[PDB]
Design a protein around this ligand. Structure first.
Ligand SMILES: [Zn+2]
Ligand SMILES: [Zn+2]
Length: 89
């Protein structure tokens, strides 16, 4: 194979490291910032998590404070009809 890596000084460890890249960036990380679990939208579609035809007229609107909310959070922040269907009870 091949080997070659040194440096007894390891970089800071942040819990906000992509689960597919394990890397962060100054700017806001996707999907969200607060949501501990961070994963690049592309890392999902690529690997094989989404691969769904979700043609939309939007590129990336997560960074913003009030934009897209990942599944984990699934917050009803966005102002729009979110008719839900909970188990009849
Ligand atoms: Zn990633
Ligand atoms: Zn989220």
């Amino acid at each position: 194979g091949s080997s070659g890596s040194s440096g007894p000084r390891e970089p800071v460890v942040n819990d906000e490291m992509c689960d597919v890249c394990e890397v962060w960036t100054a700017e806001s990380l996707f999907p969200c910032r607060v949501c501990t679990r961070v994963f690049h939208d592309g890392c999902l579609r690529r690997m094989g998590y989404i691969q769904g035809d979700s043609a939309a007229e939007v590129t990336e609107m997560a960074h913003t404070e009030t934009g897209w909310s990942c599944h984990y959070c699934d917050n009803i922040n966005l102002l729009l009809t979110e008719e839900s269907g909970p188990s009849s009870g």
